[PDB]
TrEMBL record:
Residues 413-612 form the Trans-sialidase C-terminal domain. One of its GO terms (molecular function) is exo-alpha-sialidase activity. This is Sialidase. Glycans are attached at N18, N27, N118, N426, N611. The lineage of its organism: Eukaryota, Discoba, Euglenozoa, Kinetoplastea, Metakinetoplastina. Keywords: Glycosidase, Hydrolase, Repeat, Signal. One of its GO terms (cellular component) is membrane. It is an enzyme of class 3 (hydrolase). Its EC number is 3.2.1.18. One of its GO terms (biological process) is ganglioside catabolic process.
Length: 628
């Protein structure tokens, strides 16, 4: 869906220059005051109560203006709401502000962390020092009760506490200036820790992120030792399989994602999963945007939800907010949750009592509202995809493979299984059994579990960099295993392509691949080295092919055994390769008029290098995995 889905709907919950908030004058007096713009949305669930948190930018939408933290809460899933000012600014000047809320929910408590400023008119990373700033922590307590039938709630907000005295003056050399939460919903780890991802500006104005956590419900806080590269900001964190996953805003480049198994002490870039998948615009050289990043359980499966604008317009327009869902292997684009080509921006997502919602910005002429969205259609699609994933994984995991010489052998490998091209194919499309990334086809005829190629450019292109803006197979530049069953149907004139990974760039370069020749020999291709012939094959005979790439090394297996040359380095230097696509057969839209006469079935893709036992299992069970 290229627009908020059929069945879904929204209301303008925080309405620009319309909705009022109970502004408290210096004398305790209270007056309902109109607010120019509502920005920086977060929506969470506290003990069955929806709490929507936001910047109330009273006079203008500008960052350096008079702002307070507004809250709207509901006990009836959005039928009705009450409004509060949860956090007052210092009132030091006409630009005093409390802003950019980051929120953790634990039990009936809300922990809110905001940046507080008194009088500066320029941007926080460019301040001369931290004198105008304070990081404020505020705790809110939700209390329920019920009239005759009807439930009601109140939220009591405490006095802000400055965490500035807890901020180190330096980090491993780095002289600190200010810090603020990463924006949005953060978490309680499974060990009960309060975990805030934060963004830190150093004196020279560099930005980087770290984890600030509490083991005692907010009494004390610690800054973990690890950090992101410089240039990361507005970090969002979630917990996945015993690790923190930190998803960073990165202005002017692709988004960096890190993992930490030790509560932030050590960070490692998520090169084999999520790092660099998402970005700020088609060309990636634009201002980035905040993203929500939340772990949920759908149809019994744990998954991650990620939101971000395509920003086809560029700069801060932030049009076309999308929602993605991933289980750390497959990444599914649920679609566009904003409407048409409206400008959106910062966002929040929440799964509560089996219903999906979003609170996000809409922007016309830099006057901003927050819409509260019921993601009905989206959730239906999501549930269907999750069921597809569980069902195929369980099916493959349940196959009885041959016992090997030492009831069944080891399971058909499913951990790290990203995509699968098998039986379903139609027109110019070879369908991903996992419903995320299809392959594009030309000059093919359907056969059981795959395709037979015949004609110029006969073959399939499984896009990698060619996915474009969002690169869901970006992991392959770091490591992959590509598997397939093949037959060579006709002898080639000289050398013809069968399977591999192509590289972006001039020429027709390959990272790793396999070709075959007129002498009936294999020609494995290892990076840029001369592809010399080895071995022997026979026309028509089915062969199992596996390509593995990890640690910048490449191996090619036929029938479970490595071909000569395997284990060689395929890429040099430290710059990640830039794979354009995986080719199957001899696809082309130009260049040599390649016509590889081969039939390929059951092409499997993993985001790791499979071990030798796993490879043999696949070789032994190849007539068992097809979708039929
Ligand atoms: C404290 C502050 O300025 N926060 C603002 C943030 C920041 O300025 C930028 O990340 C440069 O560091 O930008 C944006 C934004 O719509 O992109 C909204 C935040 O309110």
């Amino acid at each position: 869906a290229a627009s908020l889905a059929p069945g879904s709907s929204r209301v303008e919950l925080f309405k620009r220059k319309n909705s009022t908030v109970p502004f408290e004058e210096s004398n305790g007096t209270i007056r309902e005051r109109v607010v120019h713009s509502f920005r920086i949305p977060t929506i969470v669930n506290v003990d069955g109560v929806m709490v929507a948190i936001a910047d109330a930018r009273y006079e203008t939408s500008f960052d350096n203006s008079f702002i307070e933290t507004a809250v709207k809460y509901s006990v009836d899933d959005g039928a009705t709401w009450n409004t509060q000012i949860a956090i007052k600014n210092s009132r030091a000047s006409s630009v005093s502000r409390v802003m950019d809320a980051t929120v953790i929910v634990k039990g009936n408590k809300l922990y809110i962390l905001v940046g507080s400023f008194n009088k500066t008119r320029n941007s926080w990373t460019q301040h001369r020092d931290g004198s105008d700033w304070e990081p404020l922590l505020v705790v809110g307590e939700v209390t329920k009760s019920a009239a005759n039938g009807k439930t009601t709630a109140t939220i009591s907000w405490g006095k802000p506490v400055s965490l500035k005295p807890l901020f180190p003056a330096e980090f491993d050399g780095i002289l600190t200036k200010e810090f603020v939460g990463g924006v949005g919903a953060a978490i309680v780890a499974s060990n009960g820790n309060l975990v805030y991802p934060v963004q830190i500006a150093d004196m020279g104005g560099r930005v980087f992120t770290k984890i600030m956590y509490s083991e005692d419900d907010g009494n004390t806080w610690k800054f973990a030792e690890g950090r992101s590269k410089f240039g990361c900001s507005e970090p969002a964190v979630l917990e996945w399989e015993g690790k923190l996953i930190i998803n960073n805003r990165v202005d002017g480049n692709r988004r960096l994602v890190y993992e930490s198994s030790d509560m932030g002490k050590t960070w490692v870039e998520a090169l084999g999963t999520l790092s660099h998948v998402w970005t700020n615009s088609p060309t990636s050289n634009q201002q980035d945007c905040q993203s929500s990043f939340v772990a949920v359980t759908i149809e019994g499966k744990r998954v991650m939800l990620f939101t971000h604008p395509l920003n086809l317009k560029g700069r801060w327009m932030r049009d076309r907010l999308h929602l993605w869902m991933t289980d750390n292997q497959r990444i599914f684009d649920v679609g566009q949750i904003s409407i048409g080509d409206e400008n959106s921006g910062y966002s929040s997502v929440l799964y509560k009592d089996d219903k999906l919602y979003s609170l996000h910005e809409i922007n016309t002429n830099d006057v901003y509202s927050l819409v509260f969205v019921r993601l009905i259609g989206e959730l239906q699609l999501m549930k269907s995809v999750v069921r597809t994933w569980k069902e195929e994984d369980n099916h493959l995991a349940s196959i009885c493979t041959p016992v090997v010489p030492a009831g069944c052998g080891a399971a058909v490998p499913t951990a790290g299984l990203v995509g699968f091209l098998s039986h379903s194919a139609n027109g110019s499309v070879w369908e991903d059994v996992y419903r995320c990334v299809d392959a594009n086809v030309a000059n093919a005829e359907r056969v059981p579990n795959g395709l037979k190629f015949n004609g110029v450019g006969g073959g399939a292109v499984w896009p990698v960099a060619r996915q474009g803006q969002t690169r869901r197979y970006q992991f392959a530049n770091y490591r992959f295993t590509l598997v397939a069953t093949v037959t060579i149907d006709e002898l080639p004139k000289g050398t013809s392509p069968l399977l591999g990974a192509g590289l972006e760039g001039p020429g027709d370069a390959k990272l790793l691949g396999l070709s075959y020749d007129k002498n009936r020999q294999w020609r494995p291709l290892y990076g840029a080295a001369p592809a010399s012939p080895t071995g022997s094959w026979e026309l028509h005979k089915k062969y199992h092919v596996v390509l593995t790439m990890a640690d910048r090394q490449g191996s090619v297996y036929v029938d479970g055994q490595p071909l000569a040359g395997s284990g060689n380095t395929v890429v040099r230097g430290a710059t990640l390769p830039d794979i354009s696509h995986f080719y199957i057969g001899g696809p082309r839209s130009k260049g040599a008029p390649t016509d590889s006469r081969v039939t390929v079935t059951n092409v499997v893709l993993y985001n790791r290098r499979l071990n030798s036992s796993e490879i043999r299992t696949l070789f032994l069970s190849q007539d068992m995995i097809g979708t039929d």
